[model samples]
Each structure stands twice: as C-alpha cells, then as structure tokens.
Target: ALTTISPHDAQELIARGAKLIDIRDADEYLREHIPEADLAPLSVLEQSGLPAKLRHEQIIFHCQAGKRTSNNADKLAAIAAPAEIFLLEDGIDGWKKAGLPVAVNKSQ
Candidate 1:
C-alpha cells in the first residue's frame, strides 16, 4: 500500500530527507515543479535508476494532476521497495494550490 500525503506534510518529509519524484514529462517539469524534485517520467520510471543516495530514502511521487501517480502506485512500489513510498495527494497542482513554492526553468 502507498501512503498519501498533503503538500504541507510533504514539505516536512522532504526536510527529513525524503525524495520527491515528479513523474511528469520533461516539458512539464521544466515549466514548473516542486523545488528539488527529481524528474523521472512515468514512461521511463521502471528503467530509471535512483541515485545511490536515495536508494534507502523515503520516496514520494507526484504528477501534473495526481492521477498518473495514483494510477501507477503499484508500479512505483515495485520499483522503489525497501524504501518507503508516498504519493503527493493531488500532485503539482495541489501543491501550488497549497501555496507551496514551485521552481521554474526560464532557460527551457
């Protein structure tokens, strides 16, 4: 089972070393995303390797609308097992609605 958390709680988890994975595409992430989030699109999620530093860390996944993360919870669990799994309840939009800061790449 995957744990679901709000943007507020997610912030705390991040502060405690949890890794936030943005499961959206490159363009979506480049436009705006949670600060410090790692980009790992859903299409290549399984094939992608997590950094050695994050292998034992708590992992949280989020998409543009949250649906993708929710729908793929099982797949994410299988790939990131041993480490704890969490879903950003409503994804990036929710995080924005919660008044959290988002990082954007103007160069993109």
Candidate 2:
C-alpha cells in the first residue's frame, strides 16, 4: 500500500535522493511548482501512459491538493511498479505551508 508522508519527511527523502513527481496540469504547474518536482501531468497519463522515467528508489507523487493523487493512488502505484510509492500529504499546499521552496512564473 502507498503511504502519505508529511512535507518534512518528503523533504528528507528528497535530499536523500527520492524522486518527486508533480501530477498536476501543465497550466497549474506554470503558475507555481515545487522546484524539485518533475512534471508528469495526469492528463498525459490518461491519454498515453506514465510520462516520467522513474527510479528504483522511493517515488513521491503530488498534485495541487493531493485529492487526485489520493483518488488515483492505485493506478499510479501500478504504473510505478516495483519502486516504492509515497504521496505528499496535503500536497503542495502543505509544502508551501512548511516554507518549502517553489518555482514560480510571475508573468504567466
């Protein structure tokens, strides 16, 4: 089963080499995004398949509010295969709340 982890732990794992996948839309990501995240929109996943090259280490999937991630956890996990999966608890909102860094496009 996939586990939901807090921003603190997420940050910890990230520093330790865990991969962060941003599952939100391209437009949404254009506004603001975790600098460390890789874009892999769910829309692309729906039309094609997994869009990102995943690693054998822990994989953290996140969306705007994590609702989508929570709803599609099983499918994501299936696509993720043998790699361990994790959900960023409360999503990017929590990351911002925790004072984590994010990349933003002001002119967009």
Candidate 3:
C-alpha cells in the first residue's frame, strides 16, 4: 500500500530531501504547483516509466485534488519500489490550505 502523509509532514519530508512529483496535467501544473515539485503527469508515467533517479530516493506524489494520486497509487508503488513512496493527503489543495508556497510557470 502507498503511504499517505499530510501536507505538514510533506513539508518536513521536503526538508529531508524527499522529491515531490506532481501528477497533474501540464496546464494545471503551469497554473500552480508545489515549490520544487516535478511535473510527471500520470499519462506520461504510464507510457515512459518513472525517472530512474527516483528508484533510490524518497518520493511523494500528488494531484490536483488527491483522487488521481489515490487511483494511481499502485502504479506508483510498483515503479518506485525499493524507494519509499508517499501520497500527499488531499493533494495540492491541502498544500495550498496549509499555506505552503506554490510556484507558477511564468511562461504560462
């Protein structure tokens, strides 16, 4: 099962070198995303596979509203095995509610 962590805990993990992967679409990501989060849309993940760098690192996944991450938890788990996997509870919405900083793509 994929581990679930709150936005507060997510922040703590970030400080400890956890990588945050945003599983939302390009448009949504361009609008707003967790600071330093990487864009790895679910469709692309299904096609191209998870980044090799994540194979041995702590990873946290999140979507716009949490549903997508919940739905894709198993796939993420399989690809990120050996490394720790965490889901951001309530996704980016929760992060925003927690007053965390968000980065917007200036080119959007």
Candidate 4:
C-alpha cells in the first residue's frame, strides 16, 4: 500500500535515494518546485502517458496541494507496481510549509 509521508520524512527518503515526482503542470512547476523533484505533469500523464522513465525502487509522488495525488492513487500504483510508493502529505505546499529548500527558476 502507498503511504502518506510528511515533508521531513520525505526529505530523508530523498536523501537516501528515493525519487520524488512532481505532478503539477509546466507553468506552475516552472514558477517554483522542489530542487530534487522531477516534473511529470498530470496532464501529460493522461494525454501522452508516462513522461520520464523511472527506475527507482521507492517513488514519492506530489501535486501542488496533495489532493490530486491522493485522488489518483490507483493510477500511480499500477505504474509503480513492483516498486514501493508514497504520497507527500500536503504535496509541494507541505514541503514549503516545513521550510525545506526549493529551486525557483527566477529569483531574477
């Protein structure tokens, strides 16, 4: 079963080599996103299916506020069948709430 992980816990998971996936759209992602997160927008997933190639044993999925990821749990589960998966408790917003570092494209 997929678990809901707090930002702090998820941070440790990433440090230990788990992959973090951001499901927000391109524009939102470009404005601000986690440094370690890879973009795989939900729109692309439904329209084109599978954005990036994932080879991680443990995968963590997040959306802007978390609801989307939680709502589409089964869809991700099927894609991550052999691997274990987790959902960010409040998504990128939670990560920021925890005061973690995120890479903004333009602080310029």
lDDT of 2 by residue, 19-88 (tens): 8777777876777887367777777666665544645367788887755687788788777645787877
Residue-wise C-alpha lDDT for candidate 1, range 29-56, written one tens digit per residue: 7678774577677766756755555554
Pick the winner on TM-score between candidates 3 and 4: 3
Instruction: Write down the lDDT of every candidate, Cα atoms only.
Output: 0.72, 0.73, 0.73, 0.72
- Model 1 lDDT, residue 19, Cα: 85
Q: Candidate 1 overall Cα lDDT vs. reference?
A: 0.72
Per-prediction TM-score, please?
Answer: 0.82, 0.81, 0.83, 0.82
User: How many steric clashes between backbone atoms does each model show?
Assistant: 0, 0, 0, 0
Which candidate model has the greater TM-score, 1 or 2?
1
Candidate 4 lDDT, 7-90, residue by residue in tens:
888888888877777767777677788736777777766665443454477778888765578778778777654467787788
Clashing pairs in 2: none
Q: Compare the candidates by TM-score and give the number of the best one.
A: 3
Worst 10 residues of 1 by lDDT: 48-57
